[PDB]
Ligand binder design. Structure first.
Ligand SMILES: Nc1nc2c(c(=O)[nH]1)N=C(CNc1ccc(C(=O)O)cc1)CN2
Ligand SMILES: Nc1nc2c(c(=O)[nH]1)N=C(CNc1ccc(C(=O)O)cc1)CN2
Lengths: 265, 265
């Protein structure tokens, strides 16, 4: 069904056998022992609970200067990649920040502006030959047709990536749940996820604990585990390749049950 | 999408607005204060956590005499229906046991042998005018074609029900997960649930904590909450009207997230 593995330098990710789980690493503020030590323990924990990728990045949910984001995030990567044998993605949109992260040992790029923030990032991706996640986002919500416009917008990211030298096999798409979308639009995107498949790239889904779940269930962030469950289940059934979650133990067992049932693996 | 409500004597169940949750009531052995009091507290708890129906019945998972099953189950129904304002289904296949249960105040019949055990049950259903759940089951597993044979077998239950006087609107079907099916056949049934829809009746799904979940996840019964989650999510996405669960709080929030997303309600 995919005729290629996801190549991640040291590691290799097979897209046919199971839904791959990307664990969110909270960067609680760099350099200090407390910060880097708690991040390592948390990454070790996530590896133990069934995670396949560690996603390192903070400051999205402020506007910090770039030379600082590096001071924060570079030590984090050096440590985790040394002590947790697992691919690391860097969660930034900035070109200069991404460059450092791969240099410090990070394997995937995770751009929440899908190369539209700093088009030069896609050039960094092409050069180190890393896989890149292009997320749907935009500075507004004035959609003519939600799904039609997402697919259009995503394809504009691909165009920037490909004209930068990025190979098709190093491209992952993400519908960008929670970004430039009302609670009701987020549901529609979920309902229509299977459309992104026509584009012919692997899709990552990120819905973990987000507020649209709260809006439906009327429930604060620490009570959003079951809601997340449902979004991850519907996601996988709609053909997702990756899920980005906080609750690795739980989501990982759900993915596995989903895989058994849908006939994946 | 359904042009009719599910009529349950005192109560009425709408099939368009939400996935309806049936809570499993464990009958731990009748008459005694401890037994009936713990059953009532457990039913009150399930009502509090989002349940829409209470399912009362034990001895399926032995072979007890009929006049005893009544001594066990009749007091349970009198109590729960008095103190929990909710429809009760009786989980039996025996005609004489069902008769008593409705007489004691129970509203739905739940037959795990789909009128094939004691065809006379369907006559009890027709007479009191209660809804009946017909489950797929058989004394063997020698399937030519799993789904084709389920649908055939189910239709044999309907034939018995309808020739007994049961109205189409009082008929609910159930694929009978865990019954006369290997772990691998259970997955296939799950994968192909949407087929039962061609028959034109509401479908209840019962997979809560069952061993096929354990077989996939390699996990004992008390660790089967996420696995159950996935089965309930895929179920609802495949058009289920009811789910039969133990973990009402959790499953109830998942159903609700599923409903929001699939556009139900
Ligand atoms: N590839 C990828 N990266 C991310 C994603 C994401 O969904 N996909 N989400 C993130 C979290 N952003 C949020 C947006 C909305 C909400 C919410 O509405 O609660 C929470 C968090 C950041 N990084
Ligand atoms: N309408 C309906 N009634 C039931 C059902 C059910 O699935 N649907 N399951 C029940 C439980 N039977 C089990 C079968 C298999 C397993 C297992 O394999 O672990 C556990 C329990 C009894 N009553």
């Amino acid at each position: 069904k995919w005729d290629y593995d996801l190549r991640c330098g040291e590691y290799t990710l097979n897209l046919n056998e199971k839904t791959l789980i990307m664990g969110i690493l909270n960067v609680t503020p760099g350099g200090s022992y407390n910060e880097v030590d708690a991040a390592v323990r948390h990454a070790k924990e996530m590896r133990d609970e069934g995670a396949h990728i560690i996603d390192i990045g903070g400051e999205s949910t402020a506007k910090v200067s770039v030379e600082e984001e590096i001071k924060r995030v570079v030590p984090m990567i050096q440590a985790v990649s040394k002590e947790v044998k697992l691919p690391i993605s860097i969660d930034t949109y900035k070109a200069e920040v991404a460059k450092q992260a791969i240099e410090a040992g990070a394997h995937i790029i995770n751009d929440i502006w899908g190369a539209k923030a700093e088009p030069k990032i896609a050039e960094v991706a092409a050069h180190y030959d890393v896989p890149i996640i292009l997320m749907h986002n935009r500075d507004n919500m004035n959609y003519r047709n939600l799904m039609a416009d997402m697919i259009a917008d995503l394809y504009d990211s691909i165009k920037i990536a490909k004209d930068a030298g990025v190979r098709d096999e190093n491209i992952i798409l993400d519908p960008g749940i929670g970004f430039a979308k009302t609670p009701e639009q987020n549901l529609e995107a979920m309902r229509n996820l299977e459309q992104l498949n026509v584009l012919g790239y692997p899709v990552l889904l990120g819905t973990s604990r987000k507020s649209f779940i709260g809006h439906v269930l009327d429930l604060p962030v620490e009570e959003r585990l079951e809601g997340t469950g449902a979004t991850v289940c519907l996601g996988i059934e709609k053909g997702c390749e990756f899920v980005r979650v906080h609750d690795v133990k739980e989501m990982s067992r759900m993915a596995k049950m989903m895989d058994a049932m849908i006939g994946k693996g």
